[PDB]
Design a protein around this ligand. Structure first.
Ligand SMILES: CCCn1cnnc1-c1cccc(N2Cc3c(cc(N(C)C)nc3CNC)C2=O)n1
Ligand SMILES: CCCn1cnnc1-c1cccc(N2Cc3c(cc(N(C)C)nc3CNC)C2=O)n1
Lengths: 288, 289
């Protein structure tokens, strides 16, 4: 990263508590030694022998995002084989941290979260970025009740992998166009995020994604079977027709028929005039 | 592997000549100390901490092939951080080695090679195997003028890659079905080899594949564009309508419409009589004289 701080952030911050992991690295809550401002520091072990591509892509994504629904980026430090990504501290943690305490979210709270995530996704997709890891654990809530997408580790790993593989995929001159297409584009597109959002909406309503207790490898196989049916909400009577329809359309099996983030923003569920931060601030009130 | 020889291959063979590289490793001409038979030994560096999955997959591909048009497999040796794969030796080298001396092949010579490669591809595809690196450099010729496909390095790497990637692709519960599909199936199928054969037929005719002067990364981009026109032979009048048609159909852009290896074996260009190894023996006489 051209803007890296070649200094130890511990000279400027006190590490207060561990905030868990993620795709890679350890996240800490940190307080500025003088200002008192709180930040999240994601520490990753570096080495002169280690490939910097993944971290380089993650920093590039975060630094070029300037949107209210994407975690803010403050800079990165490099000192004594440790890289520290400095980001916005989100006081309420992830939606998973929240629902594990409060129980299932109400339909209005899920509708607001969905609107906010779709705003973030519409922005990412407009910058030709794909999150590829949407789930309750990657949707953060700050004390202000703001919804922020986080952890671009999978997105960074995918992008770095696609670029790294190119040298070894073989000679392009004799390559079939469909092989070149998967080499450059990966075999899918940004609409994979829309599906993940539909699953996240079931997770917020039910406290688990569909097939949560099934071995992760068997899930992959089940999903590729020709008979695979998109998941549905379990408690039909609890939810409005708009919510069932939101699940139906975001979980469109064919990606050619699945609606874009911008199209989804006009959906009846997420375009309700009454959706506001008050819904989340209420959720944080229950947390206390 | 319980079939590997845990010994120096020089106990059994004398190394005679360097035969170049390939996708990975170095190949040598060798002579069996007991029988005097010639073989090719491919030596690959294999450290104790290195991933064995690619080489395991290459030997599995080779060992379960029993078809004249695929180099025979004799066995493998592991010794002093080197893995040696023992295969059939092909006395005239690759078609690329040959045409760099002889110049362009004749249409009958091309037809015979295409038939032979198609027979090997029909067999591979019958086993759910994909070559994925068909080109003149990988079509080997023996002193009898017989044709063998070689170098499953790319095929082995793709197979090892699919299995290795799986653990790191992220949680599956929130994943879109198309993400899971590409993770388990790859994104394309065996018909990629039919396209590669068509490009190879142009290569044998013109001494290089289409777009060879273009930067390889730019070639990848050009092929991914909607509107990419499949390439054609340059000199229209020099080639029969049958040969131009063979190129047109093997280079069908949509893989859903591209014919199989078995389908291509019924094409008049490769089903014509007079297609035999004597055509390549003529080519080898040109190489010598
Ligand atoms: C995807 C989250 C990790 N991550 C992976 N890449 N960038 C980040 C990242 C980025 C910015 C903030 C944060 N976090 C995470 C977190 C936070 C607070 C908190 N509280 C107050 C209980 N809990 C947790 C998480 N608990 C399990 C917080 O500010 N994380
Ligand atoms: C396909 C490329 C190598 N390879 C990669 N995986 N398996 C193999 C492989 C397997 C079996 C034989 C052979 N070869 C290659 C070769 C030969 C002879 C020869 N002569 C007499 C000049 N020249 C060359 C190649 N020259 C550039 C021969 O028998 N190779």
């Amino acid at each position: 990263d051209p803007d890296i701080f070649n200094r130890d952030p511990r000279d400027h911050y006190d590490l207060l508590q561990r905030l868990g992991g993620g795709t890679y690295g350890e996240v800490f809550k940190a307080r500025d030694k003088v200002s008192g401002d709180l930040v999240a520091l994601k520490m990753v072990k570096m080495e002169p022998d280690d490939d910097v591509s993944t971290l380089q892509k993650e920093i590039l994504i975060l630094k070029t995002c300037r949107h209210a629904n994407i975690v803010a980026y403050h800079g990165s430090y490099l000192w004594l084989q440790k890289l520290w990504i400095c980001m916005e501290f989100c006081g309420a943690g992830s939606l998973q941290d929240i629902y594990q305490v409060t129980g299932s979210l109400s339909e209005l709270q899920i509708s607001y979260v969905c609107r906010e995530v779709l705003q973030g996704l519409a922005y990412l997709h407009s910058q030709k970025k794909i999150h590829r890891d949407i789930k309750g654990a990657n949707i953060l809530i700050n004390d202000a009740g703001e919804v922020r997408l986080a952890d671009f580790g999978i997105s960074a790993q995918i992008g770095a992998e696609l670029a790294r593989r190119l040298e070894f995929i073989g000679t392009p001159y004799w390559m079939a166009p469909e092989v070149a297409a998967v080499a450059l584009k990966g075999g899918y597109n940004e609409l994979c995020d829309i599906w993940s959002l539909g699953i996240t909406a079931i997770e917020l309503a039910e406290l688990q994604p569909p097939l949560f207790d099934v071995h992760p490898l068997r899930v992959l196989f089940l999903m590729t079977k020709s008979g695979y049916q998109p998941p549905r909400l379990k408690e039909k009577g609890k939810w409005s027709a708009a919510f069932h329809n939101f699940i139906k359309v975001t979980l469109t099996k064919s990606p050619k028929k699945r609606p874009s983030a911008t199209k989804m923003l006009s959906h009846q569920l997420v375009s309700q005039p009454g959706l506001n931060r008050g819904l989340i601030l209420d959720l944080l009130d229950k947390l206390k």
